[PDB]
Amino acid sequence: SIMSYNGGAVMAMKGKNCVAIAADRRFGIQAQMVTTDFQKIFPMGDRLYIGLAGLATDVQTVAQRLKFRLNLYELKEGRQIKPYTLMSMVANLLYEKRFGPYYTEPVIAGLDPKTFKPFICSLDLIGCPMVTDDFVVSGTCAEQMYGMCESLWEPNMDPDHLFETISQAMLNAVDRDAVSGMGVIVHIIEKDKITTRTLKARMD
């Protein structure tokens, strides 16, 4: 399919007072890779990120249009954006192309700007929002990511075991996929700091 033209995998997972998000690194046309440093996770303010997967054209295009609407929002209002407000903003942007749709499926993760409350959601390619309490996934290798997260997720987890859970979920699911791989990057954010780690994955 068109979603299977470049591959990709984005996973988010909710912790106790923190939230983690991960993605792969491979960029390539259908069977031939090109590079291993393709960005799929974009910062939208502090303690609030977004992940994109699907057609690599619409990954870079939507991330620039959303940044266009964000900076105009944060200047007419002195405050920063709330995580629910971004989800309503993205779903508006996708539904405007109702019949010419962008081929991407976003994943939003972040904390509350005032309190510590984590937030995860994901959307369809036309903008049906969906908030959960445990994890959201998107990409070509979706079913592999559901099988790992249903077994490894625990309700209240420190940032140590949250890191080890989403690492073991992403490493085992992506190695079963063919068109995803070549490295995995992990952002784990919290109230005090932001930790970015890259994992030792199979480069085949």
Binding site: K76, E77, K82, Y84, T85, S88, M89, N92
Partner: protein
Amino acid sequence: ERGYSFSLTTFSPSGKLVQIEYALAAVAGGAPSVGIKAANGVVLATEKKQKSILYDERSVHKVEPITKHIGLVYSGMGPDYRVLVHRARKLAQQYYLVYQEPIPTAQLVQRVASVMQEYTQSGGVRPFGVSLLICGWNEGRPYLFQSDPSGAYFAWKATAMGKNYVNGKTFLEKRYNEDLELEDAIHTAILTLKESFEGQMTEDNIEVGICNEAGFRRLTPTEVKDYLAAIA
């Protein structure tokens, strides 16, 4: 039409815009009003006298809601008031369809003042003759703003618009303070509305709306009779 599209307002040799200063004269010759920001809410009160004993008072309303936490009064000419009300209603829903969240009161005045701006600069039309007072309790702290037919806007603690506003300018300066309750604010809002009213103030000569943190609400004449029941 022919399609002229020339504006009716130009600069004086002194550098003043003449027509906008004329429209403020029509604002001062309107019905008096007062607004007071208290520590827990905002109180709006206006002065509604019918010209006869025939007019019904349950038909037209002065205190008018915009959203369920934003109300709006005026002091000017009645017919031009209803345009920007219906304009601000449709404008508030366009925020809500995009962001799925009720509009904050600071952001509403940003866009309504741009509407009143557009009739000054554009072609062939005159400006409004209506100043506004906009209220609401968004995110804990309540707000009270005033707009004018020039397109500007301010942020008042307590102010008065309409006739004898310089008397209510002095009276609210001596009466108001930093904090009260809502009930103290309605008491001093009628006492400054009793400054320029007629001989008899009833449940129907005044018309009062408030802003709780539970939302916007305008008062029925049951309470206003019981509130003006010898409480000054």
